[PDB]
Assembly symmetry: D2
Homo-oligomer: 230 residues x 4
C-alpha cells in the first residue's frame, strides 16, 4: 500500500492524490519507494472531513487510475483534513471496498501499510472487513488513538515480522507510525503532508526514521521514538 494525508487550509482531493507528478495516482502503477509490492492496483480510498468536521469516505476495490468518477469529482472535494490510500492486497486477503483504507470509527480515519498475523490480534466483532488491516484498525480504535504508540509497539513485539505503518486523522490532527515501511513529511506554507513517499521532488521533503510516531497538530510536527516492548 501507499498512503498520504493532509492537515491545513482547504485542499482538493485531486490536488493531493491525482495531480502531483509522483503522487498516489502514479504510485498505483509505479511507486518509487515500495519494498513490498510492485504496484497498488487492488483498490483505493479517500477520506476527508467536511466543513462541519464530519468524516466522509469514498472507497473502491478497482485500480485508482481507472476511476473516471473520482477523476471527475475529486477536484470539487476540498477539505482541511484528508487521508487517502492505494492498496496492494496481501495474497489470500479479500479484495473488496470494505478492505480498502481508510477505515473509520466515525471519528478517526486510518490507513495501514504493511502486514500482521491476525493470530496475535484479538478476535473482534467490530471490524469493517476480515483483512488483517481492518482487524488491526479495530484494535487501534478500541484502545484509542492517544495510545497508538503503545498499541503498535505491543503488536510489533507479538509479531516480529509485522510491518505496521499507520496513517490516521481526526479533522484537526494527524498521527502516523513508521514500523517497517516508509514515511516522509512536507511542511507547506498552508499545511502539512504526510506520505509513504514524496509525491514530487520538493527539497522540503523529509524522511521519518523507522520506529517513530509522528503527531501533527496546531502547526506542530512532533516526532517521537517508539520503544520496543519486552
Amino acid at each position: 500500500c501507499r498512503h498520504v494525508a493532509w492537515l491545513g487550509a482547504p485542499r482538493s482531493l485531486a490536488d493531493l492524490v491525482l495531480d502531483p507528478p509522483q503522487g498516489l495516482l502514479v504510485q498505483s502503477y509505479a511507486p518509487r519507494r515500495q519494498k513490498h509490492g510492485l504496484m497498488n492496483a487492488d483498490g483505493w480510498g479517500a477520506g476527508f472531513f467536511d466543513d462541519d468536521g464530519v468524516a466522509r469516505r469514498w472507497r473502491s476495490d478497482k485500480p485508482l487510475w481507472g476511476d473516471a468518477s473520482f477523476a471527475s469529482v475529486a477536484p470539487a472535494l476540498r477539505s482541511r483534513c484528508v487521508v487517502a490510500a492505494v492498496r496492494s492486497a496481501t495474497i489470500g486477503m479479500p479484495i473488496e471496498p470494505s478492505a480498502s483504507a481508510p477505515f473509520s470509527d466515525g471519528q478517526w480515519l486510518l490507513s495501514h501499510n504493511g502486514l500482521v498475523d491476525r493470530g496475535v490480534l484479538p478476535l473482534t466483532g467490530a471490524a469493517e472487513s476480515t483483512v488483517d488491516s481492518a482487524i488491526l484498525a479495530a484494535l487501534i480504535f478500541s484502545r484509542g488513538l492517544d495510545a497508538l504508540g503503545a498499541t503498535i509497539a505491543e503488536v510489533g513485539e507479538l509479531d516480529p515480522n509485522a510491518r505496521l505503518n499507520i496513517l490516521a486523522a481526526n479533522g484537526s490532527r494527524l498521527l502516523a507510525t513508521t514500523w517497517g515501511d516508509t514515511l516522509s513529511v512536507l511542511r507547506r506554507p498552508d499545511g502539512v503532508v504526510l506520505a509513504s513517499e514524496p509525491y514530487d521532488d520538493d527539497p522540503g521533503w523529509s524522511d521519518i526514521p523507522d520506529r517513530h510516531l509522528v503527531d501533527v497538530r496546531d502547526a506542530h510536527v512532533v516526532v517521537t521514538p517508539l520503544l520496543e516492548h519486552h
Copy 2:
C-alpha cells in the same frame, strides 16, 4: 429510469437524491409513477456543475441503495445545477457505468427515460456507450440543445413506439421533454425541481403534460408543445 434535476441556490446531492421520502433513492426500488420497469437497480448517475461551471459526473452500474461511498460523500457535494438518474436497463442493453445517465458533451448534462429504436438514429462515432440512450444523446448534442424539441419530435415520428423523456442542464438552464413518460415540476423559494415523479407530497408539485418541452431559467418555467 427516473431522473431529477435542480436549478437554484446551492443544494447538496444528498438533499436532492437520497434524503427525500419518495426521492430517487426510494425510486431505485419503489417508484410510484413508473409504467415501464418495476424498479431502477441497473445503475445510477449524478452530474453537477461546480462553482466554476465545470460539469462533473459520478456514475455507477450498481443499485443506488447499495452505494456506501455515495451515501457518505453526497451530503458534502453542493451545486446550483444538478441532473441525476437511476437506471432500469432495457433488456438487451449493456449494464455498465458508461450506459448510465447523465451523458455529457462537456457543456450539457443529459438523461433519457424511455426507449428508442437505434435503427432510426444516425450511426455515430461520438457516443459514450452503445445503449440506445447514448446514441440518442449523441444525436441531441449534435443537433444542439437549442433544437431539442425538434430533435425529439422528429425521432418520435420515426419511431412511434419510442419514449423520449429528456432532462438536461448546462449550469444556468434546464431543458426537458415529455414524450411517453412522466415529469413534474416543483417551484421552491430558492430554485426549481424537475423530476420524473414528485419526491414527496408537497402540494406545490405540478405535472407536465405529455409531448411538451420544458424550459427553466432565471426562476421562469416555460412549457410549450412539441409539434409534429
Copy 3:
C-alpha cells in the same frame, strides 16, 4: 435472500438457477413468497461440487439478472450437488462478493436466508466476511453440520427475533433448516431439490413446516421437528 440446492444426477447450473420459469433468476427481481425483502439484487452465488468432489464457487455483488458471463457459462457447468443463492442485503451489512452465499469451509457449501444479531454469536477468526450470515456460517461449521439443529435452536433462543433458514451441502448430502422463512422440496426421479420457493408449478412440490430440519441423502428425504431451547 432466496436459495436453491440440488442433489442427484448431473444437472447444469443454468437448468437449476436460470432456466426454470420462477426460479432463482426470476426471484432476484420478483420473488413469489418472500416476506422480508422486495427483491434479491445485492449479489448472488453458485457453488457446486465437481467430478472430483471439489467445492467450487462463483460469487458476485451485482444483480443476477444482469450477469451476462454467468448466463453464458452456466449451461456448461454441470454438477451432482449445487447450492445457489440470490441476496437481499440487510441494511448496514457490506455488499461485496465475500458476503454473498454460499459460504464454504471446503467440505460444506452453506447459504443463510434471514437475519441474526451478531452480538449473540461467538467471535471468530474464521469468517469469510463481516456480514451476520458469514459469522453464523463460521459458527455452524465449527460446531459441525451434524449439530446443525442444535446450533440453530440455540441461536434462535439467544436472538428470539432471528430468522435462521440454512441450506447446506457436502456433495453427497443436503441439510436445511426452516426457522422463520420458507422452504419447499421436490423429489425428481433423478434427484432432490430444496428451495426457498418452488421454481415451477410441479405438483410434486411440498412445503416444509417451520422450525424443522431437512436431511437429504441416499435418495431419502427426512424432515424432523426442531425443539426450541429454554436454557
Copy 4:
C-alpha cells in the same frame, strides 16, 4: 493487452490461462514482452466453444489476479478451442466488461492487442462497446474472417500508427495477425497454442515475424506475409 488461444484436445481454462508459470495470470501484472502498457489489469476475458460448438464467454473489468470466482471455476471448464485475454486499457477508453476481449459474433471469438484511430473505421451499429477494439472487431466480423488479412492491411494503410494484433477462433480454426505487437506459437502433441508471449520456457516456442497472418487448422500451422 495480452492474449492466448488453444486449438486441440480438451484443455481446462485454468491450465491454459492461470497455471503456466508465465501465462496470462502472470502477464496481468508482469508481462515479459510488452512494449505498450506496464501491465494488463483493466479487465480480462475467456471465451471457449463447448461440446456442441456454442461459443461462451466470461468477461470482467477487474484485474485477473484478483478474481476468486474464475480461480475457483476455471479448472472445471474444459474446451477444444479457447481464446482468452488480459486488458491494458488505452487512456480514455471505457473500462467495462463489454470492452474486454474476446468479442463475438456468435461464430468467431476475437481479441485485439493494439490501438487504432476509430476515425479510420466505418461507423457501426453492431459493436459491443465503444472501445476501438470493439469497433475494429465489428469491421472484421462484417468483412469475414476469411478476409482478415485484407481488412488488417487496409486498416493499417489508413492508420499507419495502428497496432493490429488479432487473435480469433471459431472452434476448429485459429486465425491471427502480427501488426506491430508480439505473437508466438507452440505446437503440442495434442494441439496448438498461439500467444502474445510464451507462457513458459518450452523449447518448442517460436516467434511469428511482424506483418504476418497465422492460420491454424487440421494440425497445420501456416504463416504467410501480409502485403
